[PDB]
Amino acid sequence: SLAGAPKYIEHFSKFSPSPLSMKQFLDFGSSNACEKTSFTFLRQELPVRLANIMKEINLLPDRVLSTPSVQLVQSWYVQSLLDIMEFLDKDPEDHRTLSQFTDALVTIRNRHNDVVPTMAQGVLEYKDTYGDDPVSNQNIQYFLDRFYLSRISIRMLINQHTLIFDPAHPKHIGSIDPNCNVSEVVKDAYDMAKLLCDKYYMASPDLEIQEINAANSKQPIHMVYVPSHLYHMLFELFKNAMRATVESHESSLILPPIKVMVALGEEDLSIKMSDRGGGVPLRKIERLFSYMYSTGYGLPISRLYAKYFQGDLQLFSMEGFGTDAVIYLKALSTDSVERLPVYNKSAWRHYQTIQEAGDWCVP
Amino acid sequence: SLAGAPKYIEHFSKFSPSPLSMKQFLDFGSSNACEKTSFTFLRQELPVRLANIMKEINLLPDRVLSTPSVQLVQSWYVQSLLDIMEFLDKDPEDHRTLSQFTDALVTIRNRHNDVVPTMAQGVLEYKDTYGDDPVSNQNIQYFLDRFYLSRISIRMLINQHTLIFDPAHPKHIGSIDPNCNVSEVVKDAYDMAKLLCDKYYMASPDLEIQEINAANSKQPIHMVYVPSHLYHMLFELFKNAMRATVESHESSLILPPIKVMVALGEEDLSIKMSDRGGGVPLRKIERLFSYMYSTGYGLPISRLYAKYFQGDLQLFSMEGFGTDAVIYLKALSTDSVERLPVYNKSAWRHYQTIQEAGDWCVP
Numbered sequence A, B: 001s002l003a004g005a006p007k008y009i010e011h012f013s014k015f016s017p018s019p020l021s022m023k024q025f026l027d028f029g030s031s032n033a034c035e036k037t038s039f040t041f042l043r044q045e046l047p048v049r050l051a052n053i054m055k056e057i058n059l060l061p062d063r064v065l066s067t068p069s070v071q072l073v074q075s076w077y078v079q080s081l082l083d084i085m086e087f088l089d090k091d092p093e094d095h096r097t098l099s100q101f102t103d104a105l106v107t108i109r110n111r112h113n114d115v116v117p118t119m120a121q122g123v124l125e126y127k128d129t130y131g132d133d134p135v136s137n138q139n140i141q142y143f144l145d146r147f148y149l150s151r152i153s154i155r156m157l158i159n160q161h162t163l164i165f166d167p168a169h170p171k172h173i174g175s176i177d178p179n180c181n182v183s184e185v186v187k188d189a190y191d192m193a194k195l196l197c198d199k200y201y202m203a204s205p206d207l208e209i210q211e212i213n214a215a216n217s218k219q220p221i222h223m224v225y226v227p228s229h230l231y232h233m234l235f236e237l238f239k240n241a242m243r244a245t246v247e248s249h250e251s252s253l254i255l256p257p258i259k260v261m262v263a264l265g266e267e268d269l270s271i272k273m274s275d276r277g278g279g280v281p282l283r284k285i286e287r288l289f290s291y292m293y294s295t296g297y298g299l300p301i302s303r304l305y306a307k308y309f310q311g312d313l314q315l316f317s318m319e320g321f322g323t324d325a326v327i328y329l330k331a332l333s334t335d336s337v338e339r340l341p342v343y344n345k346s347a348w349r350h351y352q353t354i355q356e357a358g359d360w361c362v363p
């Protein structure tokens, strides 16, 4: 009773995703009027976001697309798109439409739960089956950043709808905390990382937090943010900083602490995590964000969470000494706008590359 | 009596520049046998390096190429190439050939002395005449990085030859110090920057230096390097750090110090300069390396010096707090290999861009 998936994919891929600001997410209410609006918005926007990324999947090297795990993920996206197409002709005024829609969104979220490791298995299958090559590798890197950021954005839309229209923190708006205390999230991530570090090494570095509230030096630093995303990024950073610290201090009973600075400026809210874990040579920094070498997507996915609301996550090491990691976030909810990949000529062209000598000299 | 310049440009642009390692520069002696070798090497290599970059000049937008200052720089390169062509059929066994060659290299160096600000005037002429556009701007950025790095490499070849074969430091090999004490260069750059800061602000931050010699904690850190290049980079970084510190502390008599860490690892020699000058929002970081916004090429040219021997110069700020700048150098002379742009299909393709909507969404 539905059209074939390609007809829907072609239709919806013509549209650009519509990025929302944290402010817009936050200003969305919980009434039936609001639920109907959410429904009518998402039955267009989710297909747009699904179709856009599905079109890019098809630009992957034949070698990568031919893998069973990539084909499996594709099949999930197809079914999720079709699940939403069932709602195109349904009446929002009918409460049953709305409840059925929420049920379908939950089903989609569950279906896609294992997307990250499944795609990673696809990358492994490509390497095992064909051997890796640098052109394919570059395409995979570009694609996966966009694919995973797209997924984060779809999960955000779904979580907002299901949380609001179907509880530990009643002050939250869906998954958003309008008054997220950054240092408390830092402490939560540290605590969980410490449990793991203590388990394996029977020791862990202490934590020191310093806040710099430039405009209001006395005031504890808060922001509008999705605490789970911030936690994810900090937990990954602590795990790396702790492991470095303990492993570079095999002989020591005294471990240097991990120092976190939370700075609030006019435009940025920046969080720096500094360790004395001996560092990494610059040559090896890029590999930390590579899906290929990491095939352990902790750091690249963490950086995508940062980029999702127009921030970033950057690493700067000093080999022989230690490493600084910085999460850059927008301080203002109005500047915190979804960063969404779009399928267009620019994106298509970016794939169209081939093997050749680079523009820099080798001996 | 010479062929027209285009014939020579086409001939030599077919070759790739030949990158030398710091080790190779260093192992070059000062005998007539060595001078003849230097001559026969440079009468091929300098034309190769000149031709390669001249070919790329021609890939600039018509708008930029049409400017008088860019045309002037082009004319210098043409004459310098022709100056060397006069030596193609000369006998290296003849001492007069060798002395004349050194004279010609000096003349070329002098001719090109003002290349950096002259090209900057070209960029200004393009903006004034036509107005700037983002496509042209991207092309200019890509080109200038390569153009200025090429120039650094040509100046290195010329200085090595004229210094060795025609004195404050007899232990130096041309411009190279085989035992450069990094902290002494840091202090020299600080001293000169302080003179300037004191002149304008009547105050300057103090300096603190810490060394971390990972493998040999007692030993002062030395390396094989060109001290003038290291000085250039540090002087630029101190000027920025000092200005930030004083300007962000208008009301204070007490200024936070600039802290420098020099770390020696297995592969990297890293120099971090940390200030509490209030920082810069992330959005504005890229502009610090832009030739367009800086049209003040201090930072981008400094980063090219770092990149020239396979290093880098990176900035990470915390808005509301201060800024860290890190110079990454190779610790080993064998890893310190010239990074040279090459004119090839890859480079040519990189220019071939056009106006269009990007691969990321805007609201």
Ligand SMILES: O=C(c1ccc(O)cc1O)N1Cc2ccccc2C1
Residues within 6 Å of the ligand: A236, A237, A240, A241, A243, A244, A245, A247, A248, A275, A277, A278, A279, A280, A315, A317, A322, A323, A325
């Ligand atoms: O320098 C880092 C590092 C990387 C990323 C990061 O976020 C923080 C960090 O300290 N590591 C060196 C090292 C040695 C042994 C084991 C793990 C690690 C990680």
Ligand SMILES: O=C(c1ccc(O)cc1O)N1Cc2ccccc2C1
Residues within 6 Å of the ligand: B236, B237, B240, B241, B243, B244, B245, B247, B248, B275, B277, B278, B279, B280, B315, B317, B322, B323, B325
């Ligand atoms: O944060 C920096 C900075 C940039 C680059 C750098 O290397 C070191 C730095 O501290 N600045 C802020 C500011 C305010 C007023 C005047 C100048 C400056 C430069």
